[PDB]
Amino acid sequence: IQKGSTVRILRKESYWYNESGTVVVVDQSKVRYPVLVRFTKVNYAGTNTNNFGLNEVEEVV
Amino acid sequence: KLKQSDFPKFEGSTGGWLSAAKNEEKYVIIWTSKDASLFEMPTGGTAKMNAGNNVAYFARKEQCLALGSQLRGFKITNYKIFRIYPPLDITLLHPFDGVFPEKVNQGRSPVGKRDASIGGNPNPASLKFQ
Amino acid sequence: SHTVKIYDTCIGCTQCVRACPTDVLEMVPWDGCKAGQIASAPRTEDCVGCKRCETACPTDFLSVRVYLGGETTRSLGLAY
Amino acid sequence: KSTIVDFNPVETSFEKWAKPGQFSRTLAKGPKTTTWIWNLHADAHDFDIQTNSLQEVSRKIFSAHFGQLAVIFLWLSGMHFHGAYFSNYSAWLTNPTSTKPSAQIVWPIVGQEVLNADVGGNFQGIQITSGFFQLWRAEGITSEVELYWTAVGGLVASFLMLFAGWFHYHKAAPKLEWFQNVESMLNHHLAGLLGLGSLSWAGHQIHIALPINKLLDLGVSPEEIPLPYEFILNRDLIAQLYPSFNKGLTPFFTLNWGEYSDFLTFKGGLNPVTGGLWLTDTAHHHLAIAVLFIVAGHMYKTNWFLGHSIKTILEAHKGPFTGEGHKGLYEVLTTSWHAQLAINLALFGSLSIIVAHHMYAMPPYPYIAIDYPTQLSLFTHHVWIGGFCIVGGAAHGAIFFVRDYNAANNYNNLIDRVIRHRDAIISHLNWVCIFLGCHSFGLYVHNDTMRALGRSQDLFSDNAIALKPIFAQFIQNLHTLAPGSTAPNALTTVSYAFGGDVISVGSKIAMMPISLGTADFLVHHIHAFTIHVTVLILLKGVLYSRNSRLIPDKANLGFRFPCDGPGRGGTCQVSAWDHVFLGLFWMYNSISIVIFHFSWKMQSDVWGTVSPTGAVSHITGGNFAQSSITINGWLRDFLWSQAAQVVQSYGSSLSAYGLIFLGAHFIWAFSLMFLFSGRGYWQELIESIVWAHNKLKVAPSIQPRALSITQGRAVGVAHYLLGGIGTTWAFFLARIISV
Amino acid sequence: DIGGLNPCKDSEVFQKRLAKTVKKLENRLKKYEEGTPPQIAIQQQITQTKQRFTRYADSNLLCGNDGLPHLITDGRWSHGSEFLLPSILFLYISGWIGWVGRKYIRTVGQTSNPTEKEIIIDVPLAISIMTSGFLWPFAAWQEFLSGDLIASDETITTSP
Amino acid sequence: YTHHQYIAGFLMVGAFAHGAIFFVRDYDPAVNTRNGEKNVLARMLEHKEAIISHLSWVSLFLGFHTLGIYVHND
Amino acid sequence: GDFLVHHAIALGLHTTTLILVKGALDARGSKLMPDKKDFGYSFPCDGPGRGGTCDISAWDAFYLAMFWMLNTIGWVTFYWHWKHLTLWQGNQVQFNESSNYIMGWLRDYLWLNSSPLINGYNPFGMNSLSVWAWMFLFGHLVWATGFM
Numbered sequence A: 001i002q003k004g005s006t007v008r009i010l011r012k013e014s015y016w017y018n019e020s021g022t023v024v025v026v027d028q029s030k031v032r033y034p035v036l037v038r039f040t041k042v043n044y045a046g047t048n049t050n051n052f053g054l055n056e057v058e059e060v061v
Numbered sequence B: 001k002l003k004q005s006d007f008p009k010f011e012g013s014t015g016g017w018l019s020a021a022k023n024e025e026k027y028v029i030i031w032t033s034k035d036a037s038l039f040e041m042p043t044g045g046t047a048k049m050n051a052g053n054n055v056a057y058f059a060r061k062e063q064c065l066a067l068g069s070q071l072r073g074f075k076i077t078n079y080k081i082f083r084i085y086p087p088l089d090i091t092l093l094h095p096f097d098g099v100f101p102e103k104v105n106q107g108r109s110p111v112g113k114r115d116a117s118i119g120g121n122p123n124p125a126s127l128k129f130q
Numbered sequence C: 001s002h003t004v005k006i007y008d009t010c011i012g013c014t015q016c017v018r019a020c021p022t023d024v025l026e027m028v029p030w031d032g033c034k035a036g037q038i039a040s041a042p043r044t045e046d047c048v049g050c051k052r053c054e055t056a057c058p059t060d061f062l063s064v065r066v067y068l069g070g071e072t073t074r075s076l077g078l079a080y
Numbered sequence D: 001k002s003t004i005v006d007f008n009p010v011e012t013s014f015e016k017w018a019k020p021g022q023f024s025r026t027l028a029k030g031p032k033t034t035t036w037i038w039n040l041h042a043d044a045h046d047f048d049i050q051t052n053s054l055q056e057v058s059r060k061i062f063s064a065h066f067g068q069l070a071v072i073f074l075w076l077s078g079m080h081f082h083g084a085y086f087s088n089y090s091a092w093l094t095n096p097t098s099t100k101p102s103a104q105i106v107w108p109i110v111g112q113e114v115l116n117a118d119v120g121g122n123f124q125g126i127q128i129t130s131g132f133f134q135l136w137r138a139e140g141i142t143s144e145v146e147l148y149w150t151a152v153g154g155l156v157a158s159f160l161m162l163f164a165g166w167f168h169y170h171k172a173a174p175k176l177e178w179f180q181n182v183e184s185m186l187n188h189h190l191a192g193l194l195g196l197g198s199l200s201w202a203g204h205q206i207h208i209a210l211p212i213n214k215l216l217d218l219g220v221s222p223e224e225i226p227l228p229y230e231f232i233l234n235r236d237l238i239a240q241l242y243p244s245f246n247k248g249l250t251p252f253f254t255l256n257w258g259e260y261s262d263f264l265t266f267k268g269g270l271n272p273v274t275g276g277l278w279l280t281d282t283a284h285h286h287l288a289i290a291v292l293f294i295v296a297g298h299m300y301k302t303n304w305f306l307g308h309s310i311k312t313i314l315e316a317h318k319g320p321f322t323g324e325g326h327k328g329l330y331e332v333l334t335t336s337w338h339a340q341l342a343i344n345l346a347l348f349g350s351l352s353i354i355v356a357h358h359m360y361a362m363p364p365y366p367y368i369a370i371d372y373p374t375q376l377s378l379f380t381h382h383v384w385i386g387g388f389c390i391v392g393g394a395a396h397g398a399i400f401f402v403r404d405y406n407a408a409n410n411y412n413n414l415i416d417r418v419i420r421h422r423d424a425i426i427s428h429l430n431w432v433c434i435f436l437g438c439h440s441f442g443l444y445v446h447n448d449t450m451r452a453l454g455r456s457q458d459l460f461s462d463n464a465i466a467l468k469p470i471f472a473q474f475i476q477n478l479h480t481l482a483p484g485s486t487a488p489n490a491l492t493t494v495s496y497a498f499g500g501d502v503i504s505v506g507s508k509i510a511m512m513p514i515s516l517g518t519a520d521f522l523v524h525h526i527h528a529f530t531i532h533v534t535v536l537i538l539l540k541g542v543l544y545s546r547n548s549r550l551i552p553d554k555a556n557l558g559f560r561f562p563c564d565g566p567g568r569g570g571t572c573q574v575s576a577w578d579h580v581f582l583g584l585f586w587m588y589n590s591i592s593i594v595i596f597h598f599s600w601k602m603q604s605d606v607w608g609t610v611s612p613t614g615a616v617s618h619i620t621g622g623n624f625a626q627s628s629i630t631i632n633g634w635l636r637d638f639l640w641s642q643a644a645q646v647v648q649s650y651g652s653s654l655s656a657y658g659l660i661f662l663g664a665h666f667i668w669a670f671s672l673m674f675l676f677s678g679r680g681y682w683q684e685l686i687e688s689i690v691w692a693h694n695k696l697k698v699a700p701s702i703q704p705r706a707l708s709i710t711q712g713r714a715v716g717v718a719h720y721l722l723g724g725i726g727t728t729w730a731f732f733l734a735r736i737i738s739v
Numbered sequence E: 001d002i003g004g005l006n007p008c009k010d011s012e013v014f015q016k017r018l019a020k021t022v023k024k025l026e027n028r029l030k031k032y033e034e035g036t037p038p039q040i041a042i043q044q045q046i047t048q049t050k051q052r053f054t055r056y057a058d059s060n061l062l063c064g065n066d067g068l069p070h071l072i073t074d075g076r077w078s079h080g081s082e083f084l085l086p087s088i089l090f091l092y093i094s095g096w097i098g099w100v101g102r103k104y105i106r107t108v109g110q111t112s113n114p115t116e117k118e119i120i121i122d123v124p125l126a127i128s129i130m131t132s133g134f135l136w137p138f139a140a141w142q143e144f145l146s147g148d149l150i151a152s153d154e155t156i157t158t159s160p
Numbered sequence F: 001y002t003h004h005q006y007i008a009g010f011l012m013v014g015a016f017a018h019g020a021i022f023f024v025r026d027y028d029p030a031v032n033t034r035n036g037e038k039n040v041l042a043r044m045l046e047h048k049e050a051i052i053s054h055l056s057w058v059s060l061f062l063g064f065h066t067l068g069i070y071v072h073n074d
Numbered sequence G: 001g002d003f004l005v006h007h008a009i010a011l012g013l014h015t016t017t018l019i020l021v022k023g024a025l026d027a028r029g030s031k032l033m034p035d036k037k038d039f040g041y042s043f044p045c046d047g048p049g050r051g052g053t054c055d056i057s058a059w060d061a062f063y064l065a066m067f068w069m070l071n072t073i074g075w076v077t078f079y080w081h082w083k084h085l086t087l088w089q090g091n092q093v094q095f096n097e098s099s100n101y102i103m104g105w106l107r108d109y110l111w112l113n114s115s116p117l118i119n120g121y122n123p124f125g126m127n128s129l130s131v132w133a134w135m136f137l138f139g140h141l142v143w144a145t146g147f148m
């Protein structure tokens, strides 16, 4: 995955679970949740972006 | 007029502390101000600061912290909050290590940190009768 | 007293600490995020349960969680 | 480049009409959830958060006032047009005591033509309870052409006010200094508006209403009555009815005002022909009011070295108990629109309630006292408007405290000292509310349980333990003795309610001494208790709007917020808005009890018919004295008994009242869904509904969200008020029109 | 007949209801004068009442013991104009409404600002879609066949 | 009749409340799942949205039309 | 009338079932609270955050469904009692005609049959039904205190 890639959220406790988002940036450092994904639908708190782990996102073909 | 010279020029309100802050605990906030600014008490109405040492007593930590948050609007930062038990048992509370909690300071250890997200919490049925 | 837990989804944006009305949360060094900081809850005895901390949390399902528990004159917000 | 106005401040364009939410910084970005739609209407008139300049807020308020006055003028024009075209006003003029006023006909669709009632005068339509016919008769309007011309003038005036609002927002908007000339504004509103309006109305009454109504009462038909302009061009048509116009204005300018006693009388009582106040008394009243208000308008210093400065008056009113006194109040009321709105709305609602009382107490229109539906509707409507306006004044006082209150500018003044001892005020008001409720209501419950136990001598009744309202009876005696003793130039008491003779017009009672017994004692103390509890809720909201022992920084959360959280044991409804919500509920309770007391007492002990020998028979038969002292009595002899007409209205011309009765019950019960439930359940149900929509690929882009907590409360209270007030509306109207 | 009911053309209580309503209307008519609009309105009411009762009598309508038309909605085509035909009419109209709404949602859902086009309707596109709903039964059973009517697993689910 | 019907409603609400309590504090997904596949009870939480949506549809259908016919008669 | 009231009963049953089933299935979590199982069966809320979380617990679903159960049982018992009052009095035509519209219920069941009850004690005397009128008023008072 990279910037601009489309991924499916696999985190169950997510307002965008099973949904598709756009990767903003994948951090190359040793952070726990490097993948930053932007969504079109705001969550219940109003935010439309979140940091996800490498195993919590699945790239769409 | 007032018991201590460092008290803010407050006329007293029926919203201050009660019998609880005489036998359980009371909170005191101290700060130094450059100007005798007029500020709003967390309990009642308007009080006047002293151009120097200021000391105020409250019944709750939240009241002292609300006053301190108001003080930040006056560019006052050196305010410090203490807890006083029924006798003179003073304990510094808010600037615990001298640095505000919003700024990272070395020497602090994480308390209540779980090395997983919310989804990793154990199922309640496995937490029965413990 | 209520229970406050911090989860590694913390991004160290400090919005929880500067929203706590009773000085329960603080920022401590960490190496799990870009900011290098994580929230901590070392003074939960002053936790009142107002949940302002998790109203300011930007992470997806929160990184600070408040579990209401036993009540105390401090946690009940009793000035009397 | 005028010194009072700014020229062409805002361009007249339709571009912002196509950008909803442009006024708000947060809503301008566009909707993302359905909460945006509701926030759009909740912030439309909150001009304080739309601009950071008091000048812009003042200009918006000024133009909004113009729009509101245009709407009011359009409404009045519609009323006059309906009177001119869809009314039996001409037939009602010739038979006021036997024709029911109707000014709205119903189209014949889906069988709804049954609503066209037999109002009399060869007319079919809905009976009108707004009293426009009596008002028009008091104005001297004897033809429907005059109603048409008044409607045309109302339309022209409405367009003029619309143009004025547009002009003063887009072409010449006044500056802040112009708005802050409270001395000049008070001078003008007191002299020009009030005094000159009273003077102009006195002139109209004297020259048009006095002769035309005197001819009408003499039996002259409206067709042979001269046109109103002929009473001005010919000093002989009015000098025959009032033989004092023959002297012209010479007695006025020679201070010989005694000559004008023909048409400027001081009689009191009611006109025996029409049952209303003597229109000569009304004209004299308006003249005196005009002179008093014009004099009162020369008080405040505006542009010369003459008059008062409100700042100097307030700052001089200090005291040992009040510290700095009224210092800073002038700055509060000249820099905060919310404080002015609070004062004006509270006094305006109180004035509306006073108007409601004085209306039925002293009927001011011809043949309006014998139109019981009109009297009941006018009283209930004005009391409801007064209660709503009072709650609004409390709400805007709380809003001022949250938003526009400056602690520094109010050091040790009255506002500061009130906040400093808010605990004492609220605790003593709590004790008073408990005392009054315990006593009034528990005396009611004691009466109920004594009656249920077969102990009739243990009640708080007249034939039992008696609580005579001696203070009110003393006042009643003082008023009935006033003519000739304390008002030596009066011929009759101000109102026959205080005592005197039974005034009947066409065998129908217009006014009659309202006896006060133990039943009135209990209901009056119920009124006092309900008013005190409403004041308690609203004052607790205003005083604790900024901080408390629970939330020391409640002002930082704003005026309108749902809570601070489940902590502190639970901090629901701590706002100040949530106090205007509970106060709205309690105002509904208080006003409902007030209007119930009025309806039952009038029907049972004032209204009715008078036999030719002088025997008085009332609508219900005097059951108020003995059966209004128990809750079972109120349930049975008032609610159950007088609800018979509403439930038996199906198939008749009053069936619409039964339908509205049922619909208002439905709406009131609907409110309880929002009042009792919470947002989380509805959000989680919307989650599954959204799942279904996504499964069918029909999920809207604007994400559907459950109504916010504050909006849920607002919807609940609005539906509750609508349902309850509509139920009482249908009940009252059907009952008082049937009988 | 069906359910013990009888045709309204032979129901005495039905004619009694008609006679009572007409008598009440005529008694109301008596208290007005000449050819005045109130009398014209009451006469129109009488005429409409008579026409409605006559039409209900000659309508294959079954009346109970109260002289009111009862609806036979078990499904039989004999009384098919009471429920079945209005049912088909409503199903057509409501399917039209739902189809045009869904088509508009899916059409503006692929533009730059989908949320803007929901508070500010694209009236040209809205008119284009709305008049295309007359084929909603055919369009629905041409999109379901192609799998374009139902989502499969991109739909979101809660934690449990 | 009134007593027994009220007791019936109370008992039904209690049954559903205790089912909810079982879900909260006694339900174990691991026991009701074998190699990824879910048993008859665990599958009720998979189409829970379908169940709730169709209950909502039936409730809205019945309420809309019963109230419509009643108000039409009114 | 039986048809319409049976459909009302079906609506009440379905709505009570909807509330209870939604609370049971959503007890372990939802989108607004994907960790609701960690807070137990009965908790006040999750705070004003995320738009507001009033009555989000499973206990609150029971609490809301109690009103609907009371309403459904009220409809059932109203139907039964009115049908049997008309059957016993003999005026079964009163139910068959007036039970098809709401005002028929309000006027001929409640308003009509409440006359003996409210006259259990009047300013003139009392009957053995006086205790029932007192209980009537007592129930109204407790109902409105619940409204409080």
Ligand code: CLA
Pocket (backbone or CB within 6 Å): D061, D062, D065, D066, D069, D178, D179, D181, D182, D184, D185, D188, D189, D191, D192, D193
């Ligand atoms: C004798 C002069 C006079 C008169 C009659 C009025 C009358 C009024 N003013 Mg006003 N005002 C005046 C002087 C005057 N003002 C001055 C000198 C100032 C500056 C301090 C203001 C500042 C002011 C503000 C800021 C506001 C008012 C408002 C109002 C209205 C109150 C609403 C009401 O009672 O409805 C009664 C309504 C009527 C009786 C309808 C007929 C009234 C018409 C419009 C005559 C208005 C007179 C007007 C001043 C003449 C100017 C004409 C123009 C070509 C120059 C009322 C129309 C309020 C309002 O509603 O805004 C529109 C409001 O917000 N006034």
Ligand code: CLA
Pocket (backbone or CB within 6 Å): D041, D042, D043, D044, D045, D046, D047, D345, D388, D389, D390, D391, D392, D393, D395, D399, D559, D560, D577, D580, D581, D584, D718, D722
């Ligand atoms: C002169 C009268 C007056 C004026 C100028 C204002 C002005 C204001 N009020 Mg206010 N208020 C008033 C009277 C008034 N109020 C009264 C009498 C009450 C007591 C009920 C209140 C209670 C009140 C509260 C509790 C709040 C305000 C707020 C506000 C501000 C924003 C209003 C807004 O955007 O609403 C836009 C308009 C609407 C949303 C319209 C809503 C529709 C209403 C609720 C239903 C009306 C139904 C109608 C009768 C028809 C029903 C018939 C049915 C058959 C269909 C604004 C400064 C709010 C604020 O934030 O202030 C800063 C706020 O929180 N007011």
Ligand code: CLA
Pocket (backbone or CB within 6 Å): D429, D430, D431, D433, D434, D435, D436, D437, D438, D441, D442, D445, D533, D536, D537, D582, D583, D585, D586, G141, G144, G145, G147, G148
């Ligand atoms: C019928 C229902 C009902 C009743 C009885 C009350 C009663 C009361 N409300 Mg209210 N309230 C109601 C509905 C009701 N409310 C609703 C629906 C709402 C929603 C908006 C509110 C919202 C509300 C607010 C927001 C406030 C109140 C307040 C009050 C209190 C006013 C003080 C008073 O009179 O106390 C006296 C008590 C009574 C009159 C109740 C009856 C007591 C009897 C007659 C006498 C004593 C009986 C005796 C002790 C029995 C002993 C025997 C027993 C042990 C077996 C009072 C307790 C105010 C408050 O806190 O008090 C100051 C207040 O601020 N209420």
Ligand code: CLA
Pocket (backbone or CB within 6 Å): D688, D689, D690, D692, D693, D696, D698, E097, E098, E099, E100, E101, E102, E104, E121, E126, E129, E130, F053, F054, F056, F057, F060
């Ligand atoms: C117009 C598009 C549309 C479509 C195709 C559907 C389709 C559906 N809805 Mg639905 N709904 C819509 C709009 C729509 N809805 C709107 C606008 C609302 C808000 C009031 C709802 C609220 C809603 C609820 C609360 C529920 C459904 C349910 C359902 C499902 C069962 C059918 C039902 O109960 O109808 C429900 C229909 C209504 C309650 C009335 C809808 C209001 C109007 C008629 C629709 C709007 C028309 C729109 C403005 C047209 C504009 C298009 C034009 C610009 C081209 C089905 C998937 C149920 C479900 O999940 O069952 C599986 C369910 O519980 N919907």
Ligand code: CLA
Pocket (backbone or CB within 6 Å): F010, F011, F012, F013, F014, F015, F017, F021, G041, G042, G059, G062
């Ligand atoms: C045989 C049946 C049965 C059994 C064994 C239980 C057992 C249990 N239930 Mg349960 N429940 C039942 C039926 C049953 N319930 C029914 C029928 C309902 C629907 C109404 C419920 C609704 C329910 C809920 C919502 C909850 C429980 C809970 C519980 C658990 C704790 C109970 C507790 O703390 O009591 C506490 C007892 C009380 C608070 C006493 C309440 C007394 C009420 C108010 C009536 C008293 C007023 C009385 C009529 C006075 C008359 C007034 C006069 C003027 C006429 C326990 C395992 C709780 C739990 O945590 O489960 C794990 C829980 O949250 N149940």
Ligand SMILES: CC1=C(/C=C/C(C)=C/C=C/C(C)=C/C=C/C=C(C)/C=C/C=C(C)/C=C/C2=C(C)CCCC2(C)C)C(C)(C)CCC1
Pocket (backbone or CB within 6 Å): D076, D077, D150, D151, D152, D153, D154, D157, D196, D199, D200
């Ligand atoms: C009903 C109505 C209307 C109408 C109204 C009107 C018509 C009014 C009028 C009004 C008027 C018509 C007024 C007038 C006024 C006047 C005046 C107010 C005057 C005054 C004067 C004076 C004050 C003088 C004084 C003097 C001098 C200065 C010198 C010499 C001496 C003397 C003393 C004489 C409209 C349509 C709008 C709307 C609806 C309602």
Ligand SMILES: CC1=C(/C=C/C(C)=C/C=C/C(C)=C/C=C/C=C(C)/C=C/C=C(C)/C=C/C2=C(C)CCCC2(C)C)C(C)(C)CCC1
Pocket (backbone or CB within 6 Å): F015, F016, F018, F019, F020, F022, F023, G024
């Ligand atoms: C018609 C007929 C018949 C049949 C009948 C039948 C077949 C019936 C059935 C019935 C049924 C079939 C019923 C059922 C019901 C059910 C119910 C009523 C249920 C409920 C449920 C619940 C309550 C649940 C709970 C829970 C949950 C929530 C989850 C967890 C677990 C539990 C389980 C706890 C016969 C042939 C015999 C004869 C006659 C005719």
Ligand SMILES: CC1=C(C/C=C(\C)CCC[C@H](C)CCC[C@H](C)CCCC(C)C)C(=O)c2ccccc2C1=O
Pocket (backbone or CB within 6 Å): D673, D674, D675, D677, D678, D679, D682, D705, D706, D707, D708, D709, D711, D712, D713
């Ligand atoms: C039902 C309900 C909802 C859901 C309600 C919603 C989503 C409102 C939906 C309104 C629709 C979409 C528009 C209005 C449709 C009406 C037919 C229009 C009004 C009728 C006119 C005559 C005015 C809440 O969000 C809520 C929040 C807090 C406490 C209680 C409740 C609550 O009870």
Ligand code: SF4
Pocket (backbone or CB within 6 Å): C004, C019, C020, C021, C022, C023, C024, C025, C046, C047, C048, C049, C050, C051, C052, C053, C054, C066, D567
């Ligand atoms: S509740 Fe949330 S906000 Fe209030 S103190 Fe405990 S943590 Fe800080």
Ligand code: SF4
Pocket (backbone or CB within 6 Å): D562, D563, D564, D565, D566, D570, D571, D572, D573, D678, D709, G044, G045, G046, G047, G048, G052, G053, G054, G055
């Ligand atoms: S949600 Fe309802 S309950 Fe939970 S905190 Fe906000 S207000 Fe109090």
